[PDB]
Structure 1
Amino acid sequence: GSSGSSGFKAELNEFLTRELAEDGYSGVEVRVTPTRTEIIILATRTQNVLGEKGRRIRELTAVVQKRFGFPEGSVELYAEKVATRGSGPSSG
């Protein structure tokens, strides 16, 4: 995905920036498929954003569901970790 017009992603990024302020947020990616919407936060520490056995992600699903009006089973919430472009796998 890439920056530009898209509406939802800007509201959701504004939302999550507050939610995950100290947690280590950066941004989010989104997909919308013939099957569901997908929401993929980008943060320094994915475990904090998940919380204790997925606590925070489950709650953040419900609040997003309420705020944005998502149908259940048709929003999915994921967490990606931040990592630079560049470097190798191992090169040996």
Structure 2
Amino acid sequence: ALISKKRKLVADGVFYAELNEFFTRELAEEGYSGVEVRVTPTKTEVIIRATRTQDV
């Protein structure tokens, strides 16, 4: 760890930019529609907002 705050917040947005991609490829036939990433203690949570969750 240990990064600047600016560099951190940009870095998080790159983390978003890439994730949205990887899903926007991977889950095309499942009607993928966007992500959100929520940070907590314990975990790191990503919610796929897609229109066919039985195939995800």
Question: Any unmatched runs of 5+ in structure 1?
Answer: 50-92
Alignment partner, residue 23 of structure 1: 30
In structure 2, C-alpha distance between the alignment counterparts of 1:45 and 1:22, rounded to whole Å: 9
Q: What is the TM-score normalised by the length of structure 1?
A: 0.45
Q: Does 1:14 align with 2:2?
A: no
Q: Does 1:39 align with 2:31?
A: no
| Cα deviation 1:15-42 (Å, max 9, x = unaligned) | 0011001111001111111211001000
Question: Any unmatched runs of 5+ in structure 2?
Answer: 1-9
Count of matched residue pairs: 45
Counterpart amino acid of residue 42 in structure 1: R
> Could you say what the CA RMSD is over the residues aligned between the two structures, in angstroms?
1.2
